[PDB]
Amino acid sequence: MNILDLFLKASLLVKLIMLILIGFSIASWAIIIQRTRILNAAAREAEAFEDKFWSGIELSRLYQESQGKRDNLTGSEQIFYSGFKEFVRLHRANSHAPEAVVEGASRAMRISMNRELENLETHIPFLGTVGSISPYIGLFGTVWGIMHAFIALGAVKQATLQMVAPGIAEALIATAIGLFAAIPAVMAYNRLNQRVNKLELNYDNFMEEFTAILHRQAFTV
Amino acid sequence: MNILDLFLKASLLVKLIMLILIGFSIASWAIIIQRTRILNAAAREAEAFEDKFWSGIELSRLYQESQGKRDNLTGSEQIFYSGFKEFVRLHRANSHAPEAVVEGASRAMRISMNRELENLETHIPFLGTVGSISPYIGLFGTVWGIMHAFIALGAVKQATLQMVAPGIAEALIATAIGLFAAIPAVMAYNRLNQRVNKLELNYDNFMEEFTAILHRQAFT
């Protein structure tokens, strides 16, 4: 097809802008697929641990199951395992006050909750910047195409379509691709960001529940 | 056609606007590459220190290990060193009530957290100015350039597009460069503020969780 020769003949600045916006379009789709896969798995797997924990199983039995899974841990199970391991470590190491083992467990849960939310919201901030500035990168390429149209209309005492069309086609393509790279990010970003906040509220409620259980356990001694 | 030929013939004001917007582009790219390297180091260091500090090593050992490198200390390790140094000073040299030494240590931590945190956000608010004023400074260069064109054109008895269009093309450069200097600053300022806020939240949680240990240690 001749379309590739027309692209090779475009201005160097528009060739860079097309590589940036097509790069953002591909990266945006790769993120939307990958984060949709991960957040589906994390939402399902967290729910499938909350019931297990609330099944009336004794927590030491649940923890020695989790010790068999120690490399695969994620979500509410990684929060549980981190909380229970630190609780056992402190409650075993010396005669500590019960508030001290409850605070230590609460901390170990905070640290692993934050560290797991970083594994969920990995490339969502970038997707938000693509949806925000992609039309303004297209706008910069559009002003470059308009400038190349005016400098052609100024050149000869009567202009012709074949002289101005290179500037127009660069400007229209930079407008179109600027929108095409924005659309996937603009639909997905707010949706994915709400799904991360949905799981943040699940983990925060699991921490509050498990903290109350460990407090009620520690004060038996 | 070539940009230098249009730059050399341009009016002093639009030519000065080019040097401003190029200067903002030069400086903002340096500040982005410098800050992102510093925040990467700070994030990995703070994450490594939470894994060291909560490992169960005694604070006597962890303090004297920290003290061996005090000249190049930063992040949560600076906050710890400042807190424990003041805690030891007050509880050994004056031996006041537990809350009186613990609030003194907590103040010493609050100072070192603010001092470390403003060392992360040194030149970030410059990007916040470049990303917000750069497109307006570009547009002012373009509006001035179009007016200038019409001022040179207005002596002609019957005008036509062919004689004004070169002046409009020369004037649109300031909008294009005003955006080119803006995009990278916009992307970075919005992202670097999230990363600094995430580190501020990490240091603030470390202060409270370590203050609870100083409180319990002094009370015992």
């Binding site: 201005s11 600045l13 | 940009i3 230098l4 030069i26 790219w29 340096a30 500040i31 590459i33 410098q34």
Partner: peptide, 30 residues
């Protein structure tokens, strides 16, 4: 201590040469 200022001067040297070779490559295209 103070070496972060020399790292900033190095950062200005690399952003300046990257922009000089960008505007040179852009002018060289015509």
């Amino acid at each position: 201590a103070t070496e972060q200022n020399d790292k900033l001067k190095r950062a200005i040297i690399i952003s300046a040469v990257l922009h000089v070779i960008l505007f040179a490559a852009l002018i060289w295209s015509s």
